[PDB]
Write an enzyme that holds these catalytic residues in place. Structure first.
Site, short mmCIF file in Angstrom:
data_model
loop_
_atom_site.label_atom_id
_atom_site.label_comp_id
_atom_site.label_asym_id
_atom_site.label_seq_id
_atom_site.Cartn_x
_atom_site.Cartn_y
_atom_site.Cartn_z
N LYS B 10 -0.79 19.96 -35.83
CA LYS B 10 -0.14 21.04 -35.08
C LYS B 10 0.07 22.21 -36.03
CE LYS B 10 1.34 21.14 -30.76
NZ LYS B 10 0.38 20.68 -29.71
N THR B 57 -0.67 15.66 -31.24
CA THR B 57 -0.15 16.80 -31.99
C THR B 57 1.20 17.21 -31.42
OG1 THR B 57 -1.28 18.44 -30.62
CG2 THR B 57 -2.54 17.47 -32.40
N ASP B 58 1.36 16.98 -30.11
CA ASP B 58 2.68 17.22 -29.52
C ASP B 58 3.76 16.40 -30.18
OD1 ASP B 58 3.97 18.69 -27.20
OD2 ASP B 58 4.80 16.65 -27.07
N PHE B 159 -7.88 52.37 -66.55
CA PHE B 159 -9.11 51.63 -66.37
C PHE B 159 -10.29 52.40 -66.98
CE2 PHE B 159 -12.60 49.58 -63.88
CZ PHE B 159 -12.45 48.34 -64.48
N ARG B 176 -3.70 56.21 -63.58
CA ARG B 176 -3.99 56.08 -62.15
C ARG B 176 -2.82 55.38 -61.47
NH1 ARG B 176 -8.34 51.05 -61.73
NH2 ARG B 176 -6.93 49.45 -62.61
N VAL B 227 -6.29 45.24 -63.84
CA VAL B 227 -5.56 44.27 -63.03
C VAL B 227 -5.67 42.91 -63.73
CG1 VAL B 227 -5.36 43.14 -60.80
CG2 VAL B 227 -5.98 45.57 -60.90
N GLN B 228 -6.87 42.58 -64.15
CA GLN B 228 -7.15 41.33 -64.87
C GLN B 228 -6.17 41.00 -65.97
OE1 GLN B 228 -9.31 43.49 -63.81
NE2 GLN B 228 -11.30 42.61 -63.20
N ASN B 254 -6.85 45.34 -55.19
CA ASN B 254 -6.60 46.65 -55.80
C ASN B 254 -6.69 47.65 -54.65
OD1 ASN B 254 -6.34 48.94 -57.39
ND2 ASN B 254 -8.06 48.46 -58.75
N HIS B 256 -6.78 51.04 -53.36
CA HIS B 256 -7.15 52.31 -53.95
C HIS B 256 -6.44 53.49 -53.29
CE1 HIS B 256 -10.00 49.87 -55.90
NE2 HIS B 256 -10.77 49.65 -54.84
#
Ligand code: NA
Ligand code: NA
Ligand code: NA
Ligand code: NA
Lengths: 295, 295, 295, 295
Positions: B10, B57-58, B159, B176, B227-228, B254, B256
């Site tokens: 569920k 599933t109920d 960057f 940036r 970012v890395q 990222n 932009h």
């Protein structure tokens, strides 16, 4: 056939602006989404294929960026007024400009108990909005709002005494959950033009703040008899604290949290005063609206 | 043909729980969305139309409510462990339970500088999540995460120095905007079962808190080379502060924000050091992932 | 600390391509959304701030456009293979490329019973997808799928004979509504490289077509004993008609339509054989998965 | 303070209805989403906490189900009229009912070239909508619409001759892509009440069909001078084919597909007549509106 009404423009124009205090080093960002729709003597674009009357929506987009570059973007009531006034003043055949602005939150981060100079967080999807209608010869009509303010109180909401007939199955209650997404709009008195809007600039952030505060305080403190009753109390206080407001409109869903009867399982007690686990309902939902004005 | 793998269950089970301190009068709410998927000797449901092996599933849904009624729902790592353990212990032919929990924020409202006893606000769409895999004979595998943490810094991101070839048009930059939606996952060492999970219960909220803090502080203070680089620094500190963590995974778009050249208009200066108005880009976006473990 | 895994790339790259038959005048459009994630010897970008190993995600975006310009974009299994092969062949330190493609429908319009040469309609949100993993020295792994295929049958679905215990409230039924959103994935045998993929190009559209047909026919004609049973029958036929398929995976929500008891109102009969008005449920939903392979 | 306006009701009411031809065995399904908002002498609910005037939104929900059980749900203009008329006739203090209905597509499946008796497919997210305003003493105001009709033509759209000034960067073009999501609304002449609406019932599906056809044919065949021009041509024909229509409103985004200059890469030619690969833009978008009436 005849054109009865027409407007065209650019929607979903995302804009960011940064302000940098070279003295403190502190930076402040603003992000918004802009829609600008124009009206005027443009009917022939539709009926005669005459594009000469069309200010390209692409150019409208450019104008938005340029205006933001050359003017403050806060408070948004001022920026929208500047942008709409531009189009009606600049083009002879354009007589109305409709500017919608959604402001996104970018709240300054506190690091080590200190406010950070250039880092921000989106501390909810709550929006601050303006709708600005600028009409040649009729001034500037501004509607300000907050939207997407999601709240819940776990008790001190009631709903009893409503109409009961053969369509009614709902039971009266003296203690329920109340959850809503607040949409609140305050309509300013008409302004004669930009000079008047500028004379009132401090009132715009203070009233947004007031509206928010009143909304939050009243929701938290009112022992609510219904959504209807509580929202009237919010509208009333706002009108009482800011005389330049003509009307306050509230639109409030009632997001239901249903009790779950677990008695069928080992006589588990989960309703009324024993209610602990609830099922939030995605749909349907109640929808309650009201417009309050001055008496 | 043959069944190679199978799970069923569920999804999208919304659950609210309230806790009421009868002494203070203070109420605390919890809201979550639950998914439970089961594995076991169920292949014949698929190949022979044999529904005898199926726990409806109920019924799974019911179990979720009942478990929440009878056990703490916080921290979610504990609740998920209790719920998954239930299905494998209770049904002989069911050998694994996969429990996913998304926790929604309901932050106590402050009114008049005072914390309110029963009113709450959704102070963002940031989620706290757990994925709990409970496997008969192999213990309890828990992955905890935060997601939807949206941040932006307006400067102190760079960057430059990336690979340049005939596919490259991007210019190097020393200043940036960096904006992302943080998805961070910490994987706990395998637990032998519920007793071990319970022995560590205080570590779960403290580590979520740590992960969040480290994430926020590092983003705000790192003069990001990419970012890395920045995300590695977050993962490293988290691993350093909580030894029961085996790995940390980060997934960071990222988002932009493009400079807008307005020079074509009256020589307007809006790029490089004069950059003030930017166009947020909805798509495409960079996507940077990494899994950091112990060396 | 150490990097255990890492990938980075560009997501949400929207691409349109038009093909124009200068002889017939007939135009054909293709629209897709592309994600490309790369793996390789890039760890130092994360640990040493060394961007020299990074192929900028911006450049990845460029490559996508250029590749589409220079190669067919259909079938998407071929295009994804060409694009992934490019990155691993072109960059020495890049050893794997992960390409995800979502194809959007643009179906030729029929006007006056005649097919129109250059006008198209989005005749649903159903997607055709590929996931292509290109790994240096290990060939090309392709998973093809359809998703967002939303179907409903109003009768000839049953669900009885499931496990009943003290958590069970669901009643057995011999006639219910069955509605689902079909997610179906077929995994091809590993290909040694582009030459092999090209040798099989006609098989890709024909198998997508087959999978779709089988899915639709079996759903409509099977008197379903359960979701589990019906989906196995689909997987089996697909595997039977295309030998280059190794496995078929199905992921199917059960979107519940609940009977509404109106007996409390003038003894209105709206359940069982008198069931005419139903309440579609947004959540929760059952979720049934299975992977079928060759025996 | 005073209440200037007020309405309240139930939104997001999902409804399914099945029709079974016991002779042919053929079943037909209808699925919709309903909103009902009421107006009347309810002001005291807001100002005096007087819930006696409130018809609970829960009861409104019940009424929707019961009405669907006892009346045809197609065409939706009739069903909405029946439902709104009910509330104003049934409650003395309720003087207006606002009913919004969204109809979801469930298109009969063709299997083996034969239409299937009880299996359906959602062959797009296009909606058929009605807004029905029922006002005590002023009859029944119906606005019918189609929405979410997404189309694209790959050529035979132009845009040249527009206003050029110092805000303009857009280049004129004689061949571009035109893509939009069609929102079209036709407003019927006021009806005196249900008897009149029933006398016109065949006109509702035929006009929806006409509107759709005209919309599709004109988009495909018009060599478009602009969005403005093409949409006027649609509105005009609709008004010409159905005299009971007072106005036609169109709201059309211009979903931009931008050329991509690849000349920087090996002198690749991808613009103007060599344009083959385009970048669909998510935002911003043009937005063009017009209301056409009888001259
Ligand atoms: Na003007
Ligand atoms: Na077991
Ligand atoms: Na390589
Ligand atoms: Na009435």
């Amino acid at each position: 056939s005849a054109v009865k009404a027409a407007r065209y423009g650019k929607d979903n124009v995302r804009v960011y602006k940064v302000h940098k205090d070279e003295k403190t080093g502190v930076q402040t960002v603003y992000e918004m989404t802009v829609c600008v729709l124009l009206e005027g003597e443009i009917e022939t674009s539709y009926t005669k294929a005459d594009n000469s009357v069309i200010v390209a929506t692409d150019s409208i987009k450019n104008t938005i960026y340029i205006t933001a570059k050359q003017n403050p973007v806060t408070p948004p009531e001022l920026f929208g007024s500047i942008l709409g006034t531009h189009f009606i003043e600049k083009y002879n055949h354009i007589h109305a400009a409709h500017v919608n602005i959604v402001c996104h939150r970018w709240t300054r981060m506190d690091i080590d108990g200190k406010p950070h100079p250039h880092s921000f967080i989106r501390d909810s999807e709550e929006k601050r909005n303006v709708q600005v209608d600028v009409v040649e010869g009729k001034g500037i009509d501004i509607k300000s709002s907050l939207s997407g303010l999601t709240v819940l109180k776990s008790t001190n909401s009631q709903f009893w005494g409503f109409l009961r007939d053969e369509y009614t199955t709902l039971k009266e209650t003296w203690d329920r959950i109340l959850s809503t997404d607040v949409d609140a709009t305050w309509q300013w008195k008409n302004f004669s033009g930009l000079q008047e809007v500028r004379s009132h600039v401090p009132k715009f952030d203070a009233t947004w703040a007031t509206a928010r505060e009143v909304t939050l305080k009243t929701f938290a403190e009112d022992n609510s008899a219904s959504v209807q009753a509580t929202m009237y109390k919010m509208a009333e206080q706002i009108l009482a604290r800011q005389q330049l407001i003509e009307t306050v409109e509230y639109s409030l869903p009632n997001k239901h949290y249903f009790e779950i009867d677990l008695s069928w399982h080992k006589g588990l007690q989960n309703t009324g005063k024993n209610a602990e686990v609830f099922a939030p309902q995605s749909d349907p939902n109640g929808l309650i609206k009201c417009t309050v004005g001055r008496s």
